[PDB]
Write a protein that binds this ligand. Structure first.
Ligand SMILES: O=C(NO)c1cnc(NC2(c3ccccc3)CCC(F)(F)CC2)nc1
Ligand SMILES: [K+]
Ligand SMILES: [K+]
Ligand SMILES: [Zn+2]
Length: 364
């Protein structure tokens, strides 16, 4: 029972089977199997694992995938399960930045099913919040195609899965703090006012992957979805804790509170972390802890943290373990001295404010 209340529980999902997805031609490709085992091992080292309720992985079904993806796309990825290597190579090469092994399809299904089980546990009160240590990632995957190490859009599917077991209009916030724009998530929800998508990402006037002006601040959503897509694009600066904290203070949290989400999904890539070989930014583990802590003030604390990217194995292990520590209710660690904001970060924050003040009274 929870008569009289009870201490909130944090769920954790991790299944070593998701390590089987691998790059048979470049075994040093940074989207490594041991991304998830290293993160899991750090949770054991820090004694966080035994404090969590372990949530089992499961496979997503093909009908669950159709919540966001076309039958053609599902069928093509499914067909890779039985391909020979030369045909896996050719099929991967048809996409932007995709490698495929015979286990990729099953691993993508497990990453999605793990997050469905976690959202289910949160929404039915089995746990208050959860962390999902999953791969391959999701947020670059589109309705019709794979992209950027992602086959199916785990976070987008989880938002639709949540609506499917509560009510169609359940308000879901997705905060995407992966250093890359989540092009797939933006596109899936661009006309939808029930899912608010807020992405922070390195942009560089369109030069940074995925190299599209869709990631710019002026893309605010379409139709009913106008105002429900918030891009915070970083240009010309080595961004870190001061800039992300300022973005949360001026943009993410005011908009999120006004939206009043009923569930928060974090597309939690850690490739903006200090030390990441791809992102080039310097968010610290303590910074990620503070971002997590702020999001826990939303949705009565119903937050699911979903691993996306992040490629320095030590950085992502420490950063995601910080986030779990915050979900468990530990007191936030001290931030380093916040250097004054990079001046271009103020420019970006002010551009987003101008783009979104028409839709959010909290910004006016
Ligand atoms: O998921 C991600 N990060 O979290 C992610 C990161 N990099 C790529 N692609 C790029 C990449 C691919 C393999 C190894 C390093 C980088 C290749 C094309 C590029 F040069 F344009 C950008 C980098 N794709 C997805
Ligand atoms: K992002
Ligand atoms: K939206
Ligand atoms: Zn990324």
């Amino acid at each position: 029972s929870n008569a009289g209340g009870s201490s909130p529980i944090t769920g954790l999902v991790y299944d070593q089977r998701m390590m089987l997805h691998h790059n048979m031609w470049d075994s040093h490709h940074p989207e490594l199997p041991q991304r998830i085992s290293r993160i899991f091992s750090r949770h054991e080292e820090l004694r966080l694992l035994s404090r969590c309720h372990r949530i089992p992985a499961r496979l997503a079904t093909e009908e669950e995938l159709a919540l966001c993806h076309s039958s053609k796309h599902i069928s093509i990825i499914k067909s890779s399960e039985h391909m020979k290597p030369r045909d896996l190579n050719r099929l991967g090469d048809e996409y932007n930045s995709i490698f495929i092994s015979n286990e990729s399809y099953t691993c993508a299904l497990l990453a999605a099913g793990s997050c469905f089980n976690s959202a289910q546990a949160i929404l039915t009160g089995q746990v208050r919040n959860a962390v999902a240590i999953v791969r391959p990632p999701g947020h670059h995957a589109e309705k019709d195609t794979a992209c950027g190490f992602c086959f199916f859009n785990t976070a987008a599917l989880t938002a639709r899965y949540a609506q499917s077991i509560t009510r169609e209009s359940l308000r879901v916030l997705i905060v995407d703090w992966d250093v890359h724009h989540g092009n797939g998530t933006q596109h899936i929800f661009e006309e939808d006012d029930s899912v608010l998508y807020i992405s922070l990402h390195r942009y560089e006037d369109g030069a940074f992957f995925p190299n599209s002006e869709d990631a710019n601040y002026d893309k605010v959503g379409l139709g009913k979805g106008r105002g429900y897509n918030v891009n915070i694009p970083w240009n010309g600066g080595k961004m870190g804790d001061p800039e992300y904290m300022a973005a949360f203070h001026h943009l993410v949290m005011p908009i999120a509170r006004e939206f009043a989400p009923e569930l928060v999904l974090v597309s939690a890539g850690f490739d903006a972390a200090r030390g990441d070989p791809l992102g080039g930014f310097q968010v610290t583990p303590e910074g990620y802890a503070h971002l997590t802590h702020q999001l826990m003030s939303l949705a009565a604390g119903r937050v699911l943290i979903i691993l996306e990217g992040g490629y320095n194995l030590t950085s992502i292990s420490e950063s995601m373990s910080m986030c779990t520590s915050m979900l468990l209710g530990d007191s936030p660690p001290s931030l380093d001295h916040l250097t004054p904001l990079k001046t271009s970060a103020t420019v970006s924050i002010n551009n987003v404010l101008r783009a979104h003040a028409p839709f959010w009274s909290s910004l006016r």
